[PDB]
Amino acid sequence: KFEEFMTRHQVHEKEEFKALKTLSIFYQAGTSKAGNPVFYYVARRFKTGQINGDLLIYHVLLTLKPYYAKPYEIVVDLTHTGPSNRFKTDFLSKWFVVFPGFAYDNVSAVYIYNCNSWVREYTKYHERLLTGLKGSKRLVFIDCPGKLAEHIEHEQQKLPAATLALEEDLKVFHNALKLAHKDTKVSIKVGSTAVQVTSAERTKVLGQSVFLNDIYYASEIEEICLVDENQFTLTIANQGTPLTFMHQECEAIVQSIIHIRTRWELSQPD
Amino acid sequence: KFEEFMTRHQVHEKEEFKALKTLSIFYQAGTSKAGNPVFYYVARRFKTGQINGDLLIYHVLLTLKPYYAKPYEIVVDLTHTGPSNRFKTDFLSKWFVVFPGFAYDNVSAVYIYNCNSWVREYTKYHERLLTGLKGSKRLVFIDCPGKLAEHIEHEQQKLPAATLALEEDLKVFHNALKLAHKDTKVSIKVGSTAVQVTSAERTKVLGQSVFLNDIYYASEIEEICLVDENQFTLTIANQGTPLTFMHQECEAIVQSIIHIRTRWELSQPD
Numbered sequence: 001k002f003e004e005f006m007t008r009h010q011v012h013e014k015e016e017f018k019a020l021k022t023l024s025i026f027y028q029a030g031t032s033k034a035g036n037p038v039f040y041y042v043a044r045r046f047k048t049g050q051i052n053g054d055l056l057i058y059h060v061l062l063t064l065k066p067y068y069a070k071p072y073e074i075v076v077d078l079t080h081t082g083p084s085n086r087f088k089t090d091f092l093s094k095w096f097v098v099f100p101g102f103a104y105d106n107v108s109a110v111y112i113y114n115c116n117s118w119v120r121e122y123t124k125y126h127e128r129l130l131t132g133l134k135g136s137k138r139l140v141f142i143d144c145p146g147k148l149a150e151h152i153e154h155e156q157q158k159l160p161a162a163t164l165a166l167e168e169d170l171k172v173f174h175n176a177l178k179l180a181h182k183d184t185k186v187s188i189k190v191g192s193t194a195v196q197v198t199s200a201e202r203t204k205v206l207g208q209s210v211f212l213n214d215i216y217y218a219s220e221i222e223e224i225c226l227v228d229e230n231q232f233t234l235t236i237a238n239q240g241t242p243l244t245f246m247h248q249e250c251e252a253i254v255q256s257i258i259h260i261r262t263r264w265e266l267s268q269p270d
Numbered sequence: 271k272f273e274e275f276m277t278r279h280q281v282h283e284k285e286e287f288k289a290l291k292t293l294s295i296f297y298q299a300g301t302s303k304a305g306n307p308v309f310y311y312v313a314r315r316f317k318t319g320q321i322n323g324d325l326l327i328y329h330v331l332l333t334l335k336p337y338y339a340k341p342y343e344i345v346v347d348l349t350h351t352g353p354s355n356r357f358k359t360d361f362l363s364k365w366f367v368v369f370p371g372f373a374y375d376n377v378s379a380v381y382i383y384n385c386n387s388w389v390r391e392y393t394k395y396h397e398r399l400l401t402g403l404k405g406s407k408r409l410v411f412i413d414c415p416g417k418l419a420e421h422i423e424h425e426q427q428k429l430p431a432a433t434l435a436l437e438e439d440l441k442v443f444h445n446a447l448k449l450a451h452k453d454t455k456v457s458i459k460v461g462s463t464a465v466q467v468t469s470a471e472r473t474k475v476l477g478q479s480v481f482l483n484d485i486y487y488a489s490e491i492e493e494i495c496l497v498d499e500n501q502f503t504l505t506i507a508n509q510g511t512p513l514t515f516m517h518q519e520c521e522a523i524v525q526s527i528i529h530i531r532t533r534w535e536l537s538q539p540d
């Protein structure tokens with residue numbers, strides 16, 4: 001939309017805008033197996049309050065400008081995406097008008113990576129705006145890290161190194177159950193830096209059945225309570241409501257998590 | 271001084287004071303080989319400007335009162351102590367008068383742990399108020415971690431866990447040379463979370479020849495740079511002029527430091 005294009009050009013690229021590039025929130029990297037240019041959006045790298053929306057969306061416009069006249073694909077990294085990264089209602093709706101019609105058409109495929117519970121609720125709450133994304137063949141959720149290789153060569157992939165690191169050396173606990181108004185089978189994976197709870201059964205997101213992956217850095221873990229011989233709880237910072245899980249070896253799970261919370265506290269800024 | 275005993279009792283400890291115990295800057299722990307109650311002061315734990323000095327002194331005064339009538343010893347952990355942990359002149363002086371005479375005399379010995387370059391400079395800078403400490407034999411510097419056992423049995427030692435963490439799994443580079451106007455024989459030790467530059471030769475601190483242990487967390491390392499095959503740069507956050515080191519294995523050192531810096535970056539907040 002050149003009307004927004006020029007409104008953003010009456011004052012040329014400032015020095016805050018140029019900072020967006022260095023933080024690698026949206027960038028082009030690699031080519032897909034289909035022979036299309038790939039772009040990456042690292043959701044967790046956007047802070048609602050800290051980052052000016054108009055600059056971001058404009059930074060994306062300049063990035064896609066040269067490419068979006070032809071086929072191209074987007075990889076959306078939803079790793080550890082939470083409230084602090086959300087696009088507020090009014091800002092979210094901008095994305096549907098600021099780009100040319102063909103730019104939207106030329107998107108060959110969108111690859112959703114590490115979709116989580118919060119994002120699901122987000123799409124739930126913004127079900128209106130995202131109806132065009134509902135049951136779309138272009139929308140492709142990555143069940144597990146290994147399936148992305150089906151669309152993009154492993155070497156052509158360029159996810160944030162921090163994202164890939166979350167897939168290394170995990171103590172995995174299968175057959176766990178997440179207790180709530182609605183029970184759900186999950187796997188509880190403990191890493192040196194965080195804890196990941198992956199749904200063992202598919203769930204609905206934007207019309208598709210997918211696997212969610214909730215990530216909690218050790219820094220977010222406040223309270224760790226062992227309730228029973230097969231039940232424990234986690235208190236996540238700024239989340240309020242405690243998470244409850246059931247597992248045969250809750251004693252081993254808690255110890256494992258306490259350890260990573262400790263190793264973290266040790267190496268911290270005094 | 272019972273004026274501080276009075277002035278502090280007329281208002282008391284309602285709020286913030288109770289938080290001084292939660293961060294444990296000064297605490298009693300263990301018993302020395304001499305047969306005395308040991309107390310610890312974690313210098314890094316105190317943040318000048320954030321914590322009220324009078325409240326701190328009041329804390330220390332209370333956790334000492336039950337004991338300072340009899341002989342006791344103090345272990346001051348100067349690990350990673352810097353400017354943001356300093357005692358302002360007017361606050362420093364308050365320490366020499368607020369306590370009862372006998373309370374001072376009853377300090378059997380003070381064990382200084384991990385004294386660094388900055389503290390030494392702070393000492394030289396505040397020489398006027400620290401003149402009584404110059405030459406004092408009650409001041410016992412700890413050459414190396416093991417030497418502490420000469421005064422406190424291992425099972426009694428209660429140094430902060432974070433301190434002990436810096437002692438294990440270290441890749442050491444001996445016979446290195448720190449390049450300045452005055453060149454200093456130093457050993458460079460790379461831990462999983464920090465780099466330690468330990469002086470191989472002694473310098474003067476409060477009138478005593480001792481070794482220094484400069485500690486730089488992975489989070490403080492902004493710029494590593496290999497100059498020669500045997501010389502490299504080490505830029506620390508908020509210290510300006512970078513450190514310079516000579517060593518036959520500089521390539522190996524730089525590669526090791528870059529590693530722990532990269533690993534740290536892969537674990538940082540969004």
Ligand SMILES: CCCCCCCCCCCCCCCCCC(=O)O[C@H](COC(=O)CCCCCCCCCCCCCCC)COP(=O)(O)OCCN
Pocket residue numbers: 041043060074076081085086087095096097099103104107110112119122123132133
């Ligand atoms: C806010 C929380 C965190 C971010 C994610 C929020 C959404 C939930 C998770 C799923 C994200 C899927 C977004 C995919 C966008 C790229 C391609 C696409 O799906 O198609 C078009 C979008 O193509 C674009 O140009 C998007 C450019 C990417 C920049 C930023 C990436 C993610 C930002 C959040 C959602 C934006 C979706 C686009 C809205 C038009 C939309 O056209 P339409 O179906 O609505 O038909 C009529 C159009 N008026």
Ligand SMILES: CCCCCCCCCCCCCCCCCC(=O)O[C@H](COC(=O)CCCCCCCCCCCCCCC)COP(=O)(O)OCCN
Pocket residue numbers: 311313330344346351352355356357362365366367369373374375377380382389392393402403406
């Ligand atoms: C007496 C003052 C104690 C605090 C000194 C702070 C300045 C930092 C110096 C650099 C490292 C060495 C630590 C100092 C050891 C303290 C022991 C000492 O010498 O005092 C004796 C006994 O000290 C105590 O009983 C103090 C009890 C609590 C100690 C907690 C304070 C430790 C501060 C360490 C970090 C400060 C600065 C960090 C960064 C700038 C009594 O001798 P005096 O008769 O000369 O004193 C009064 C004369 N009328």
Ligand code: NA
Pocket residue numbers: 304305306341
């Ligand atoms: Na004794």
